[PDB]
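cache lookup: miss for this entity combination. No prior model stored, computing from scratch. Input as submitted by user K.M.:
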Amino acid sequence: YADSFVIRGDEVRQIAPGQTGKIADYNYKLPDDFTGCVIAWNSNNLDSKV
Amino acid sequence: YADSFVIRGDEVRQIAPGQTGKIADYNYKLPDDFTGCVIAWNSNNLDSKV
């Protein structure tokens, strides 16, 4: 399974098993026994406008 | 006459008549009787690599 989206810089730490915040409990919740990997990178120069 | 270059974000104030600094007195100097105009804009998403 591959899931993709775009979030804020601060909130990448919320994508982890057993984590609390705003995205975790309202937008994207991970299973506690999740197995797999998470990849995140910077897209400021592609998704930001003046 | 049109002159073009690229400088650090903080140095835009150094491009002014009768101004002193590092670029203002070693790379580009504006005459005290300068007439004309100056334009500066952002290139963070064009001239920056990971």
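stored under new cache key. Helices of chain A lie at 23-26, 44-47.
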